[PDB]
């Protein structure tokens, strides 16, 4: 649905306006999980090739972790941008059409009549 | 004293004076003199020893008091922050009212045992109160269900009040 957005630069991974958003922290829980996935891929690499799982290829295990965290950082950066855009469009559209989104009239519970169904 | 005497009333005790007629001795009287010397006094010595220790390092605990908060009738629909405090206050009062019915029931049971074979007459003030509170408790909290809440309590009251004002209105037209 968010394809022909008015504020848009097509075929860009991270448009310019995304730089005005806070970056994901290097201690982001999502980023730690992505790194943990890289480590799991390293162990499975040893297992399928009948190498010692925990020790063999520490250099290889290091690049599995780094590549996942490197790719994960940018995907998270774009994930938070696309959700910022959705809210930005949602709020702008609400201002442009106030009649469609009126301020609800609030009545206390002392006056609103709710039926009572006894449990007997 | 331990408990407030007003909350748990007890009419004054009247112990009739002994008046022996037989020449034999009363075995209980001598046992009472042997129980109070080999049981009561030794137990009192230990307690007095224990009581002295407590007085050396007295420390207090207080009865938590809850500030009043707006009731469910003063909360806007779907206002969780205002509905949260109102609902929690209602739950506390429900617990308090449960114990009130326990205080009254405890008094009613005590009267039946204290008055003995004449309980069916001397226990008239308690039974009147017991029926008084139980009727009030039933109206406030009954048939609400396991998932009871302040909203359902408010709805039940509004059901009773409407059926009362309608009854009062149409009584004059009889
Ligand atoms: C692991 C997933 C669970 C697997 C169990 C199976 C579940 C399967 C069903 C799927 C259900 C959905 C997943 C569960 C819900 C999680 C998503 C969610 O709802 O909340 C948003 C969730 C947490 O947000 P938040 O805690 O509310 O944020 C507040 C603070 O930022 C939080 O604290 P902070 O940001 O201030 O500090 C960060 C702190 C991490 O502090 C945390 O908050 C981590 C705990 C996350 C919340 C608990 C999630 C429940 C699962 C338990 C995870 C325990 C991980 C402990 C690892 C111990 C091993 C060393 O330390 C770091 O991670 C920095 C790296 C050094 O964010 C995510 O979307 C990521 C979810 C992925 C898991 C993150 C935690 C593990 C990361 C390290 C990997 C550990 C090994 C993996 C163990 C599993 C082995 C297979
Ligand atoms: C080689 C390409 C073919 C192999 C990949 C085929 C995967 C198909 C799965 C759908 C594509 C994934 C979604 C595309 C996307 O979001 O990234 C494109 C992003 C965002 O493009 P976008 O947001 O402007 O919209 C175009 C893509 N659709 C319509 C599908 C959303 O653009 C880039 O990353 C290109 C810049 C890097 C240049 C290389
Ligand atoms: C499953 C997961 C599979 C993951 C496969 C890897 C896909 C992500 C790889 C990202 C690697 C990031 C490289 C560094 C990014 C960077 O520095 O930017 C440079 C360039 C794009 O930059 P640019 O858009 O041109 O900015 C110019 C602004 N004037 O960088 C680029 O070329 C942009 C990255 C190209 C790949 C685009 C992929 C976007 C679509 C994501 C597909 C995977 C989504 C998985 C969703 C699963 C849901 C749980």
UniProtKB/Swiss-Prot annotation, chain A:
It is a single-pass membrane protein. The chain crosses the membrane at residues 57-76. InterPro entries: NDUC2. There is a minor unacetylated form of subunit B14.5b. Belongs to the complex I NDUFC2 subunit family. It comes from the Eukaryota. It comes from Bos taurus. One of its GO terms (cellular component) is respiratory chain complex I. The keyword Mitochondrion applies. It is found in: Mitochondrion inner membrane. Complex I is composed of 45 different subunits. Interacts with TMEM242. Keywords: Acetylation, Electron transport, Membrane, Mitochondrion, Mitochondrion inner membrane, Respiratory chain, Transmembrane, Transmembrane helix, Transport. This is NADH dehydrogenase [ubiquinone] 1 subunit C2. The modification N-acetylmethionine is found at residue 1. One of its GO terms (biological process) is mitochondrial respiratory chain complex I assembly. Accessory subunit of the mitochondrial membrane respiratory chain NADH dehydrogenase (Complex I), that is believed not to be involved in catalysis but required for the complex assembly. Complex I functions in the transfer of electrons from NADH to the respiratory chain. The immediate electron acceptor for the enzyme is believed to be ubiquinone.
UniProtKB/Swiss-Prot annotation, chain B:
The keyword Glycoprotein does not apply. Accessory subunit that is involved in the functional assembly of the mitochondrial respiratory chain complex I. Complex I has an NADH dehydrogenase activity with ubiquinone as an immediate electron acceptor and mediates the transfer of electrons from NADH to the respiratory chain. Complex I is composed of 45 different subunits. Interacts with CHCHD4. GO terms for cellular component: mitochondrial inner membrane; mitochondrion; respiratory chain complex I. The modification Phosphoserine is found at residue 149. This is NADH dehydrogenase [ubiquinone] 1 beta subcomplex subunit 10. It is found in: Mitochondrion inner membrane. Keywords: Electron transport, Membrane, Mitochondrion, Mitochondrion inner membrane, Phosphoprotein, Respiratory chain, Transport. Residues 1-13 have a biased composition (Basic and acidic residues). It comes from Bos taurus. It comes from the Eukaryota. It is a peripheral membrane protein. Residues 1-25 are annotated as: Disordered. Belongs to the complex I NDUFB10 subunit family.
